[PDB]
Amino acid sequence: APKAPADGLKMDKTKQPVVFNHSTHKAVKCGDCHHPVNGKEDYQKCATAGCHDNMDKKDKSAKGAYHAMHDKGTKFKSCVGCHLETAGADAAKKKELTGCKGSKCHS
Ligand code: HEM
Ligand code: HEM
Numbered sequence: 001a002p003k004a005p006a007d008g009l010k011m012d013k014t015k016q017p018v019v020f021n022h023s024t025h026k027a028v029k030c031g032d033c034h035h036p037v038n039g040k041e042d043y044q045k046c047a048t049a050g051c052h053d054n055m056d057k058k059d060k061s062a063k064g065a066y067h068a069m070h071d072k073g074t075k076f077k078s079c080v081g082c083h084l085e086t087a088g089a090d091a092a093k094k095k096e097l098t099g100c101k102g103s104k105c106h107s
């Protein structure tokens with residue numbers, strides 16, 4: 001089995017880098033994030049060539065990196081999509097977990 005890496009991982013393909021902590025996500029199954037591709041959970045970096053390697057933040061294809069982290073209605077819950085469900089009607093949690101600035105993802 002692949003092992004979860006250390007906390008403090010920087011996602012840094014963009015000018016708005018974000019820190020990802022596996023430990024705060026330990027209740028989520030690994031494969032919900034490292035989702036199947038060709039029938040096998042894929043543990044490569046999300047923006048690997050052929051994966052979410054389209055760095056145009058308006059792209060909505062399966063290659064759009066922004067889309068994969070921010071949008072609702074995706075085949076796997078995105079970072080923002082899952083956080084919206086988690087926050088519910090709690091506006092303070094919405095700001096913390098889904099805000100575009102001054103949130104836990106973006107300062
Ligand atoms: C579940 C226990 C689980 C495992 C196992 C796992 C592994 C894993 C690895 C090996 C990496 C490093 C990939 C690399 O080669 O750099 C990695 C990175 C990320 N993970 Fe993960 N991961 C597990 C669980 C989860 C869960 C539940 C999520 C989503 C909430 C998640 C997400 C990520 C993200 C994002 C990264 C960074 C990838 C990037 O492109 O740098 N993981 N994980
Ligand atoms: C890295 C942890 C990672 C994330 C995050 C991620 C997200 C993601 C989402 C949210 C979707 C659905 C988008 C939609 O519009 O429905 C999605 C879809 C696909 N991904 Fe992905 N993905 C991550 C990692 C990887 C890796 C490493 C690859 C390439 C091997 C990859 C590829 C794809 C493909 C292809 C799709 C479409 C799959 C389908 O069943 O339709 N992703 N990803």
Ligand code: HEM
Pocket residue numbers: 018019020021024025028032033069077078079080082083086093097104105
């Ligand atoms: C997608 C790569 C992704 C990111 C980025 C992300 C970030 C994140 C942060 C910054 C926190 C706050 C705690 C910390 O600093 O680690 C946080 C918290 C929760 N998340 Fe998350 N998260 C991403 C993805 C996902 C996905 C796909 C889910 C659900 C399927 C999810 C869930 C949660 C939950 C639950 C928490 C705790 C909420 C709380 O109130 O603290 N995240 N995430």
Ligand code: HEM
Pocket residue numbers: 011012013014015016017018055056057066069070079080083097098099100101103104105106
């Ligand atoms: C609020 C809906 C929101 C906005 C707007 C937003 C914007 C944003 C930008 C402009 C980028 C860079 C895109 C580029 O290629 O230039 C970016 C990148 C990431 N974001 Fe974001 N973002 C918003 C909210 C959130 C939230 C609440 C999270 C965490 C749950 C989050 C996550 C991410 C991640 C991950 C990236 C990629 C980081 C990297 O690889 O550099 N965003 N976002």
